[model samples]
Each structure stands twice: as structure tokens, then as C-alpha cells.
Target: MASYAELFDIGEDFAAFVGHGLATEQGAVARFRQKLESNGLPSALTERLQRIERRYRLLVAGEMWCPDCQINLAALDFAQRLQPNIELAIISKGRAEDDLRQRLALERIAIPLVLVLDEEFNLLGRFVERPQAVLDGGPQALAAYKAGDYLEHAIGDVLAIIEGAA
Candidate 1:
């Protein structure tokens, strides 16, 4: 499997093409924060995100070929930028199926899995594929299906699980 550095370097190129820059861009942070605020996330969720920003790190297993990976990874990148205290690592999906299966408890194919962990690398939670609760579709469709509330809800769930660990 490729190292995080290798994956990040590769992702950086693809991210640049797609305008994702949680690690590099300044303006993306503002936009991300605005999006979060506009989505009506609760203060608890926001506070949890801020608190986790201090002690948590994110690991994403994905590839550039997948559109869902592209969108969510970019959103996560932007999230890290807006919540600067959080750290992030990107892992290549090349041949890490074994690792992913163990980490994510996957018995079948999975792509673009996002894992949340503490500084010591203990898993806090994860979002695998779309949640069963979320209707299947593209981002725009999902957004509309939730009446533009999916992102906020998703972020809240992530933050809630992270906060629960504390």
C-alpha cells in the first residue's frame, strides 16, 4: 500500500484540478465555514468539531477515479481547513483492501471510506458509502432530497460520535 505522503501528493494534484485545498488554500476555509453555518448545524456539533480539531485526525481511503471520493474528500479537505486544529491523512486505494476490510469491517467492496481517530489511532467512528438512511443519488440530488440538510446532518453525526469518545 502507498504511504500517506504518496497518497497526499497524488491527491494534491487531483485536488488542484478540482479546486480542493484544505491543507493549502486560505479562501476555501471561509467558504467551508459559511457552508457549515448556513446548513444550520447545532452548537454542540460545531463545538465537537472544534474540540476534535484539537485531538483528532482524519484518515481517508479513496482514489481519484471515484466521483463520490472526489466530492467528499474535497469537502473533508475544506472542513479541515475551516477547522484548522484537526489533522488529516489520505491513503491510496490501490491495494489496501485488506487493511480497509479490517479497519472498516467491510465484507464487500467499499470506496471512499472516511475514518475518524484519536492521536493514538484508535478508531472513533466512520462513514462508509452513503448511510442507509440517506437516499441514493448524486450530491445535488442527495442535497435536494434532504432539503439541503444532508451535509449538516452528516457532519453532526460525525462530530457526535467523536464527542462521545470524550
Candidate 2:
């Protein structure tokens, strides 16, 4: 088996090819947009999304071999499209093991950990791991899984955390 770092590096390159604006070709953008529009996310959520745009950076720690990482990456790409201005820092899971371990020691390091940071890289909060409901029952258990209701729910959770601090 490859080290997490090696796996993560591979994931980074793959994400680069499939994420950001490049994701448009993969139909991720259209799928995300349709989900968001149908979910009835409040304008406040959109406003929050925009506010965080360019104002914060996200550090994603994951491996390409992980299916959960793939789902979260798609969701992250979807969130980025919903709020195009948000900048991101892609950290390979293997390469950042020390930092990840430290963060995990502090209760962070959860796979697909999305850390929201200020422009100065100050920690805000994070959406760690797939929500329990999603993990246990998959995406359809919306009533039991607030964070897995849809792409919007995931995005909304991130925005809500940021907005609460505002």
C-alpha cells in the first residue's frame, strides 16, 4: 500500500485536473448548481458564501484512494463554484502528516478535513469528515443527517459557521 502522502499527492493532481474551473467539463458544476437551486438555500447563505470568497482559504487533507475523499472533493468543488471567490490550499495527506497529526492531536485531522482560515491563515473552524449520518446510512438519510441533506447542506454548514462568526 502507498503511504498516505503518496496517495494524497496523486489526489492533488487529480483534483487539480477535475476541480476549480476545470470541473466544469466533468458536469460537477451543473450538478451542483441544480442541487443548490433545488435545495432552497437562503440568500443569506449565498451572501455568506460570497463574504468568505477570497477572504479565507481552505486546506484540504485527503487521499485519492479514499472514496469518502472523492465525495467530499466533489462537494468542495461544488461549494467553490457556488462561491467562486473562495481561495484554497490543497495539502497532500501524506506530505502533511506532521501537521495533520498535530491538528488531529488538537482534534482535527479528520479525513477530508476542511479548515477555514482567515486571510492571515488564522483558524476559524472546519467541517470534519463525512457527517455521521452520511457515513452510516449514505446520502438519502436526509432527515437524520443535517450535513448530508445534499450538496447545499454541506455548503450551508460551512457558510453557517463562517456567518456565525461574522
Candidate 3:
């Protein structure tokens, strides 16, 4: 709803952001990457990603120190690498909160706020904080997420939003 293009301009590339995370928190970021490599993406999902016809810019609001952010952002960066049609950028949490609050009437801006935007930077959808199941399933779900059980779910949630906007 806001001028997402401007945000994208000021944001850092997804890979750059991850590089910063790796440089700063090597152990945690490396461990998260290992988990994703082990979990792997489904073949069907891979095929779907390759078939994406439209371009999208994923606007992320996260901090490097957040474990949840590391995991989900890694997943998003992985997906972006697989498809050339998708782009990603990272913004500060405070900036996203302020921007969404003022322009989109978003009252509570969560960390790792991933806003999916079209080529023109129009809002398509978003994947906020954590996947819905993880958010609603209490501590057990969170534990599973930490154990790398929900990486696919998080990826699916984000992809669903993009595909829906298609």
C-alpha cells in the first residue's frame, strides 16, 4: 500500500544481508544454513518456483541476531537464488514498523516482516514473524521449528502468498 519501491531502494540485497549475518554471527547463521541444506526443498516446489512468470520484490524487515529471522530469511534467499524472477531486499525493523503503521495501518509490526511486492512495488501479501502454524501451535511448534522441521512450511507460506498474487 505504501511506496514499496522506495523501501526497496534503501534496502540491502538478501544475499548481502545474509553475508553480513554470517560475518557477524558465523556459528548461528552457518548452523541455520546447514539445516536448510539438510531439509531441502521439495521437487514440486522447485518446479513451481522455476515456472514463476512475474517478477517480485520481497521486502524484509529483520535483525541479524534473530534466530527466526536467520532461518526464514535463509529460506527466502534460497528461493530467490533458484528463480531469477524474484528479488529480495532487507530493511530495518523500525523502518518497516513505521512505514506500515503510517501508510498501511499495520498496528503491530512483527520482526522478519516479509512484504511481497509486485514489479511495480504494489503489496501482494506478506509472511510475518513466523508461519501461521508455528505462531498458533505454541511452544511445541516453535521447538519443531528450531529443530528445522518447519523450514518447508515457512517457505510454502511465503510462496503461497506470491503464487496467490499471480
Candidate 4:
């Protein structure tokens, strides 16, 4: 049996969505647009990405206003730049709410949940919410970030699920 019957697109398509919001509405990403800055693609952990055989996409359901979304999206965006085979899509909360709440297992409608999918868009795994830096403990790490560590944690955590799937 397949894990996910349907999943959304990520990477460029998501970028276009964000771009549309930017072009049409200012309040959506008002926090990040003027302030958000990238820390660059944290050296690309191609180790596992290289190990991943089929193309996979990471569909992210998030919100522009979400404080977590602001920073999490930046990290994910950089990671996507380095891995085309594995994409990173961003779906805004307003647009993606039903999917998130119903299909995505979001109990309270949190921002930024990543669903990993194979070439056929079958579910591979999932990465949920904020980086371990925040989950681990943080006001300090949240801003500074050990990018490689957090990136590995997010990707590796879900990759393990795919590798073990029956």
C-alpha cells in the first residue's frame, strides 16, 4: 500500500507561489521580505542526497506570518538550491489549510510540515515543524543555527523512514 495517495509540489512551484504573494500582497511576508536573509546553502549535505536514488519532493505546508515559517523556510530554501532531485515546496497556511489539517495530520494547524515523496509522488517520509535547534533548546541557536546539523537532522530523520519502509 502507498503511504500518500496525493501530495503537493515544492521548489520552483512553491517559489512562484511566494512570488505571487510578494507581487500581489505585501502583508503576507512583510516580516521576512524586508528582514529575512539567507545564511547560504550550508555546504550541501550531498552525502544522503547522493544516496537517494529516485527523485523526491518535500512539500512544505507553512504560513508567511509564522515566526517558525520565516526562519525554517530560509533554511529549507537554501537546502533546495543544493538538491534538485529532492525539492522543497512551500504552501501557505491560508491556501494549504485543509490539506494540512485533514491530509497532513496537523492537529493544531502548525506551520511548516514537510512531506517527502517519491518520483510518482508516493509518500517517502515526513519532517515536521521547526528545526531541532529550536526543538532542542533555543533563543540563541534559533538565530545563529548550526545549519549543517539541523539540516542533517531534518533530512536524515525522514530518510531513515524511507529506507526502512516495508
Candidate 5:
């Protein structure tokens, strides 16, 4: 195993990439942190979440204005903090991770894609855009979330995408 500093340098790059301003990353952090405060991690996940295990690096490429990142990124970030085994680093769209974004191609590159990586930073899997439930949830779910609702149904799905392997 490597020290967090060595494994987490990519995270440092992401810190620079995370959006700024209270209206940007700060707000995302705030609103998302609020969600985290309201809902605790599932018990089974907490047990598995902590300490070293698996490829465990959760790297993200997101934008502050993106509605999905407001909740998904924060939830994932909060969970990673609680779990020592999981480490999270989020880069802004197009700021870094050019090759990565290109490789996972389609019509155009995507944002808020969580790349699950090996200890060597190789991709193991990914949850692109928003997790299933939220993307499926659409406007109604966004409204519910903005109205101070944390849809257990949807959030659980997001958590599963990030934590299932753990």
C-alpha cells in the first residue's frame, strides 16, 4: 500500500479543478453536505467503507453549474471522507483528465463522470453523469431534492454505484 499523499496526488490536481465561489463549488459543497448531514450512510456500507480495500480511488470530472454534481458529487465526497478505504478527487470538466474524457467517448465528452480506479489509477468502472435513479428521476426528482428532499430511492442507487464494489 502507498501513503495517501502518493496515491492522492491526482486528488490534489482535482482540488485545483473543483469549481470556486459560494455560488459554485462552495454552494455545491454546502447543499450536498447538507444532504449528507440529513442522511447517514447505510450501516453495511459504513463497515465496508472504512480502511484500505479494493482499487478504491474515486476520481470525478464535474462542473459546478451541473445540477447532478450538486448532489451526487457531494454525497460521494462525503462518503469517501467517512470511509478511509475510499479516496475521492474531482477535476472540473476539461481542466484535466483529457485522455480519460476522450477515451470514454460519444458525441461529445461528458461531465460528472466518477471513474473508479485501481491503486495505480487505472479505470475499473464508472458511473457516468448522474446515477440511474436521479437521471431517471428527471425534473420531479430535482424539484424534490431542491425542496430539501433526499430521495432515499434515488440516493441509494447513487450510493450503490459508488459503494457496491466496496
Candidate 6:
């Protein structure tokens, strides 16, 4: 039977995803790594992330070609490194649209469509595309978003879901 956990089972882990990106999307990979270095997590956020004990699988629907994916996934990768209990995986946009939208009841598919699931594959929450700050913030925010300024917001929101999961 079709199931969300199955997606995680088949999805590429962070290393594989980075390998694929390095091979085909070097520019994206470069930018992502740059963000990982420059957008360092704050001490408070780092402490919060380190506190998570429950296992989580962050099943993501994104591609390196996408700028949002490049930035956001980098943030996720950073957080996953801090919390060993958390896992990260990636799938294509088409696969996510075809398999996830209807199942998750999403009005429309978005790249970097991250579904935060517990060990049991139950949905705790989701982070769709770009951060809300980038969506709502004006031109300055857009500039910052392009420069990968809102990475902490993405990590914070995802952590909220992870920590809040029952």
C-alpha cells in the first residue's frame, strides 16, 4: 500500500542528495555549502535543536535547481547534523506533486515541501517553499532571502514542529 513512510524509505539521504547535486548542480551545491557556513545557527537555537531526542525523518520534495531548495535544504542539513536523531531525505518535485499533494491535502505543490514526520510517519507539521518572512517581508527581505539570510527561521520553524510532535 502507498504510504508516506515508503517515500522516506526510497528517498535519497543527505549525502546522496549532496553527491547528486555536486555532480549535476555544482553551482547550487556551492551556494548551499556557502550558506551552511555563513548562516551559522544561533547558540539558543542550537541548544533547542540539540535537545530533541525523538527521531524524525524530514522527507523533502525539492531539487537543487531551485534556489529555495538550495537555501532551505542547506539549513535543514545543518540542523540534521546537530541532531543525530533527525534524518533528511530528498525527492523530485514531480514525485512530490504526484504522491504528496493529494495525500497531504495540500492546495498546491511547492518545492522544498518538507513534511516533518515522527518515527511512525505521522505528520507533525510542514514547511512549504520559502520562509514566511521572505514571503511577507518586502524588498529588503527579498534581497536577504537571495543571500540566504533567513536560514534560522527555517530551522526554527522545523524544530518547532519536531519538538511539538506528540
Best by lDDT: 6
Candidate with the larger TM-score of 1 and 3: 3
In angstroms, the error of model 6 at 93 is 0.8
For all candidates, the clash counts are 0, 1, 0, 2, 0, 0
Misplaced by over 4 Å in model 1 are 1-44, 131-149
- By TM-score, rank the candidates, best first: 6, 3, 5, 4, 1, 2
Q: Which stretches of candidate 3 lie over 4 Å from their true place?
A: 22-24
1-166: candidate 6 lDDT, tens digit per residue:
3588788888998777767764546566567667767767789998888888788999999887778888888888888877889898888898987888888888878889999988888888899988877888977788888777888888888988877765
| lDDT of prediction 5 | 0.59
lDDT of 1 by residue, 109-154 (tens): 4666767776666778886655434645565566642333345544
User: What is residue 81's positional error in candidate 6, in angstroms?
Assistant: 1.2
CA displacement after TM-score superposition, residue 104 of candidate 3 (Å): 2.8
Model 6, residue 1: displacement in angstroms? 6.1
Candidate 2 per-residue C-alpha lDDT over 1-166 given as tens digits, one digit per residue, 9 for 90 to 100? 3333333334343346345333334454345445555665667666666676446556667654444455555566666766665544466555456655664454435566767666665667877767443656765674544332455556666666567666
User: On a 0 to 100 scale, what is the lDDT of residue 68 in model 3?
Assistant: 80
lDDT for each residue of candidate 3 in 92-163, tens digit (9 for 90 to 100): 888877777667567777778898888887888888888877988988778888766777677788778887
C-alpha-based local distance difference test score of model 2 = 0.56
- Assess candidate 1 and give its lDDT: 0.55
Please report the TM-score between candidate 3 and the true structure: 0.89
lDDT of each: 0.55, 0.56, 0.79, 0.55, 0.59, 0.82
- For candidate 2, the per-residue lDDT at 131 reads 48
Candidate 4 per-residue lDDT over residues 1-166, each given as its tens digit: 1133343533335466455554423343343333323322223444654566667777777765555555556555544555666666666665456555666555666667777677777776666676654577766666544233354445455556556654
lDDT of 5 by residue, 70-136 (tens): 6666666666556556667765566435445446664455666776766766556777765566567
Candidate 6 clash figure, as a count: 0
